[PDB]
Design a protein around this ligand. Structure first.
Ligand SMILES: [Mn+2]
Ligand SMILES: [Mn+2]
Ligand SMILES: [Mn+2]
Ligand SMILES: [Mn+2]
Lengths: 234, 238, 243, 237
C-alpha cells in the first residue's frame, strides 16, 4: 500500500518524521508537509522537493506553501494513487472541543473527503519533550489496529508521553464557564484576559479521560455535523 | 431577552448591522465584532494572552447599539461580549458575506462564534448569505431574516443552528448538512516568472442530496441546519 | 482629472468613503481597497502570484463610485487601480482609522499605498485621523478634508504628502516629521497561567518639537508633511574612517 | 564591545549565524531573532532560550514571537548593555525602494532609534545559494570598515555572492511602470498578475548599480523622511 504523511507543524517537525518512519513499516511512504485549514483555491500553491538527511531513511517529500489540506490534495497529485493519509504526529494534543480547530485533523479529514482512509496523531506536551524512540512501539501498535479496520475510516489519535494501553474513545464534550479578567498594561491601557474553563471533569470513556489515564486514545470521527435529533423541532 | 451579535467579517460589515437590526426586533442587542486589520488566524478563544477591545459607535443610518470592536477572534468577541453585556441569552453571528454550507461549516469563523456561545450554555445561530458575483441586498433580505429569527426562537433552548439565506429566498426549510465526497483536481502552472505552482480545484462528485443545506439554497430556500458538538462517529464505537 | 482612492483598513471603512466623497469634488473618483479577512501580509505589490479582485457596490449612504475589493495589499490596490481605471492622475489613501505620525510613517500601510502611486510617477497623499478614545466624525471633518485637498491640488506635481487630521481641527500647517530618540522599556510579566512574557513599552525621550507633525496635531491643527522617497543620508557618502 | 545580532528570516536562517560568527571576531555576540515590523505594544511578547546551530560557535540566543523590532527591544533587555545592532544576513536583497519596508532594515533602524549604531546585511538570491564560507572574508572586511565610522551610524549593506570590491552608495530611486496581466484560473475565474518594472538602468553610485558590478554596497540611511524642498511657511496674516 502507498501512504501519504503530512502534518500541521511543518516539514522540520520531529513528529512528522517519526510518523513517516513508523508508517514505512506498513507500506511505501511519501511526505507533503507545510512550509511553516481548507484547500486553497484563491491562488496557486508552491511546493519544493525536500531532501532527506545523512542520518535518515529517504522518503520522497515536498515542502508545501499551503494548508495541511493543500498538502493532501497536492500529495495525491504528485504521488498518486494513495491508499492512506496520516497526519502528525502533532506536538500538542487534539482532544474534545480542540478537534474542530485542528489543522492536524483537517488534513486527515481532507483525505477522507477524497475517499481515502485517514488518521491524525497528536501528543500532549505537559512540560516535557516527547521521546519518539519510546513512542515508536505505540505508533506501530496503533497503526496495526487502524489497518485492520473496515475501510474507509477516519480516526483521531492522541498518545500520552508514556502510554500504558490503548482505548477506543468518544470525544469529550463539556460545557464551559466563561471567565474574563480585566487588566491594564504598564501604560495604564486596558485589556482583557480570557480564561474559560470546563464545568466538570472529563467523563470516563472520553478521549480526554483516556489520555489522562495514560492510554492512547482513538476516536472515530464523523463528517456530518447535523444534529439529527432536532430535524423536526417543537 | 438579551442578544449578543457578532461576526467574522469585521465591525464595519453591512451584514453585521443587518443582523443586529433584525435581532433588535426580538430583544435588546449588544454588538462585539472583530476590528479591522488583523491577520485572520484561528477560531478559538485567545487564552492567557491580553486582548484589546474598544467601545464603538453603531452606524448612523441604523438604530443605536452598544458595541465594541475587538482585536481578537470571533470566539473572543463572544467571550468578551458575555462579560461586558452579561447576562446574554442568545448569540447570533453573521450575516456572513459568503456561504457556509456542507463541508464549509467545519472551518467557518461565523459558525465558530455561534458554537462558542453554545459551548457557554447559550442558544446560538450563524447566518450566511452566498454571494458569488451578485451582491447581497440586506434591505431586500430583512423580511426573511425576521421570519427566520421568528422560527428559531420557537425552538427549545438551547439550540445551535446554521442558517444560509439565498439572495432572494422563496421558502424556509430545516435541513441536514450536505456531505459529499470530493475529487482533488490539481492543475500544474507557471507564473510569469517561469516558476512552478499548482492550482487546486477540488470538485464534489455528485449533486447535493435532497433535503441538504446545499440543495435547499440551490432551490432558493433559506436553509436552517441544527448542529451537533459531538464529532464522534458512534456507529464505529463498540 | 481621475483620482484613485484606496486605504489599508478595508473596503467597508467609513474613512475610505469619506475620502472618496471629498475627492469627488475635484475629479472623477475610482475606489480599489483591501477585502476583509486577509492573512497578515507586507506592503509590497504581490508579484508572480495571481491576485483576486471583484467589482464592489459602493455603500448605500454614499454617492456612487466604481469600486473593486481586492484580496491583496494596499500597494496591490494601487497597481490594480491604475490598470482598471487608467489613466490616473492622483492616488489618495485613507482616511486611516488611526494616526500615522513621526516614526509611524515608515510602517504605515496607508502611506505605503500613497508611496506606491508616487513610485508609479503620480501625485499622492495619505490621510489619517487619531483614534483610541473616540472614533472620528467624518461629517464634521469634511470641510477640513476639502480645504486640505484644495491646498494639495495647488502644489507642483508630482507630490507625496502625509496628512494627519485631529478630530476637531482648528487650523492647518505644513510640518516636518517628528524624529525622536526612544527608550526601549521592557517590563517582564506573567499570564494567568504563570507563563512569562514581556511588555514592550517604547517611549520618546522628549516632547514633540514645535513644527513637527506630532506637535501640530496635538495643537488641534491638520498636519501635512511632504515626504522624500530617497532614504540616503547624503552627508555620509564619503565618510571619514578612524586611523 | 557587545553586539546584538538579529534578522527577519528567523532563528533557523544560515544567514543569521553567518553574521553572528563574523561579528564575534569584533566583540561578544548575543542573538535574538523572530520565531517565524515595529515594536509590539498592544500585547506582550513571548521569547524563549534557543540553542545555536550544531557545528557552529555557541551564542546566547532567544527566538522571539514578534517582529524584528521586538527582537531588538527584547535583546537589549536580555543582553544589555549593547553597543551595536546587526541585522541579517538576509537571504534576499534589500536595495532601492525595497529598503522602506525591509524587516531586516527595520531592526537596524530600531537599534538606531534606541541610540546605538546599527547595520543591516543582505545577499541577493536566484540560482546559487549563498556560500557563507566564501562570503566570510567580505563580511569581516565590511564589519571592520563599519567599525571605523564615526558613531552612531546606520548603514544598509548588500553583498553580492562573490564580491570583488566595496563601495559606499546612494539608495537607488527609480520610477516604476505598472504592469498588470489579466488572466483566468483553470476554472475560468478571473485574477490578475502584477509585474511592475523599473523604467531605466540603475545609476552609477547607487546600491543596485554597485551590486550589479560585483561590489559590496553600503548605504548610510537617514531617518527623517521630511522633504525640506517642499516645507512651507504659514500663510498667517
Ligand atoms: Mn500543530
Ligand atoms: Mn466571513
Ligand atoms: Mn489602518
Ligand atoms: Mn527576509
Amino acid at each position: 500500500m502507498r501512504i501519504l504523511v503530512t502534518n500541521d507543524d511543518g516539514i522540520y517537525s520531529p513528529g512528522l518524521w517519526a510518523l513517516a518512519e513508523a508508517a514505512s513499516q506498513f507500506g511505501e511512504v511519501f511526505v507533503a508537509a507545510p512550509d511553516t485549514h481548507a484547500i486553497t483555491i484563491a491562488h496557486p500553491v508552491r511546493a519544493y522537493p525536500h531532501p532527506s538527511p545523512l542520518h535518515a531513511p529517504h522518503f520522497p517529500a515536498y515542502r508545501v506553501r499551503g494548508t495541511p489540506a493543500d498538502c493532501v490534495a497536492l500529495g495525491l497529485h504528485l504521488f498518486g494513487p494513495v491508499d492512506l493519509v496520516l497526519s502528525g504526529v502533532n506536538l500538542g494534543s487534539n482532544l474534545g472541543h480542540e478537534i474542530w480547530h485542528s489543522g492536524t485533523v483537517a488534513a486527515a479529514k481532507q483525505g477522507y473527503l477524497f475517499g481515502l482512509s485517514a488518521a491524525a496523531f497528536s501528543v500532549p506536551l505537559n512540560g516535557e519533550v516527547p521521546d519518539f524512540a519510546g513512542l515508536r512501539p505505540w505508533l506501530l501498535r496503533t497503526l496495526e489496529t487502524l489497518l485492520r479496520l473496515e475501510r474507509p475510516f477516519l480516526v483521531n489519535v492522541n498518545l500520552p508521553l508514556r502510554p500504558k494501553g490503548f482505548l477506543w474513545t468518544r470525544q469529550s464534550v463539556r460545557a464551559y464557564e466563561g471567565v474574563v479578567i480585566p487588566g491594564e498594561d504598564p501604560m495604564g491601557r486596558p485589556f482583557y484576559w480570557f480564561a474559560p474553563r470546563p464545568l466538570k471533569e472529563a467523563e470516563e470513556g472520553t478521549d480526554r479521560w483516556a489520555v489522562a489515564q495514560g492510554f492512547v486514545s482513538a476516536t472515530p470521527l464523523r463528517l456530518d455535523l447535523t444534529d439529527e435529533t432536532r430535524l423536526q423541532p417543537t
